[PDB]
Symmetry: D2
Subunit: 120 residues, 4 copies
């Protein structure tokens, strides 16, 4: 589970999620989006259930990226909420919320879904 | 902005969000939910736009809580995505996704909205 | 309940929702948005639980507006999902999804929340 | 487009969506869910952009089902918001909100995503 989550993951858009799962429930790493107003890697942090169902069938987790790095600032942040499912074709299945700051409040949040796998 | 976000916040359900905004864009703290399968404080981590619009009118941010502490484990995680709005009646306006692990995938994610203020 | 829902409602943005609840569970009417790429009235249709909890404490309902009328076409559609709560300060509390067609799939859907009341 | 949408569609859960797209932008039909507190067919209604991009590359649409029929009442309603994409492998790509009435307001709305195809 700690072991299952730690590593490099890829979504359906070609984005790359590099994460380390801590014994304490921490997620730390970097995110590189293949799309949008983004380039290179962005810091992420999050949390996961460090004592889930032992069958690896669904470990709840989430993380945040703020879209500011040394190259760009998109004045926005995405949070992903989902679960890690272990096994031969391990997956992290997520839904996400992307909020844009000021750069029309009602129109400030996009929603979508990303599925991450261990192979691109 | 760093200064604006750091502190104790309260939502409409009576929950308490204690956060420190780092110069580096980190959010760290604790969350206590007034509702659901939760008691006492849970670790949170997140990110915020550390170079936003300078008028404090909308700073993008997000954070995650995994609902495991030393009292309980609800095998779930919530992510909040939103923006900090400064001024006399400072607010963090969020939308959230709560994913439940295994404890029916299609029915695993709740969505809602929380508005945080500096006074309860 | 049929009686409770039928009528004119107003949200926090100043939009106007005019609806008739049918005995058969139909919702029919018009929507005028105070915001976005919209003017005048748009057709809506939806459904509601025509045999809910009798205390009026929470009747599930939803409706759709496609943002095409004789004035404009924003090539988009919004769906509202929520519940009608009766009583002295009757409310329809909703969450909404706004999808934009082609005019970047991942960025095609906004999410938000609207609270409707019988007085503006 | 009218022609493209009208017909029987199937999602990844094995649910069946039967719809007629009207010249006027109406969607009418029946929905049968393969999952949840549901059996047999439920009435749906919705709307679609009846003058979209002519390449069939993304027509915005939405619909509602209230989960009451002559067999069951789940005191809930789902709205789907998405777009129809034409071509050899035609699709309706949606995100959905399912609200439950009274049967804990904060926990009343599920969110997910369904992809409909013309073959099961
Ligand atoms: Ir999914
Ligand atoms: Ir800027
Ligand atoms: Ir998708
Ligand atoms: Ir999917
Ligand atoms: Ir809001
Ligand atoms: Ir458990
Ligand atoms: Ir609310
Ligand atoms: Ir609000
Ligand atoms: Ir609400
Ligand atoms: Ir157009
Ligand atoms: Ir709001
Ligand atoms: Ir609210
Ligand atoms: Ir999608
Ligand atoms: Ir009932
Ligand atoms: Ir899925
Ligand atoms: Ir998908």
């Amino acid at each position: 589970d700690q072991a299952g989550i730690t590593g490099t993951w890829y979504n359906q858009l070609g984005s790359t999620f590099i994460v380390t799962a801590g014994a304490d429930g921490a997620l730390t790493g970097t995110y590189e989006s293949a799309v949008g107003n983004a380039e290179s890697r962005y810091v992420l942090t999050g949390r996961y259930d460090s004592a889930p169902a032992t069958d690896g069938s669904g470990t709840a987790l989430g993380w945040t990226v703020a879209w500011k790095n040394n190259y760009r600032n998109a004045h926005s942040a995405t949070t992903w909420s989902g679960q890690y499912v272990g096994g031969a074709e391990a997956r992290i299945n997520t839904q996400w919320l992307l909020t844009v700051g000021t750069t029309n409040a009602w129109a400030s949040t996009l929603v979508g879904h990303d599925t991450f796998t261990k192979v691109k």
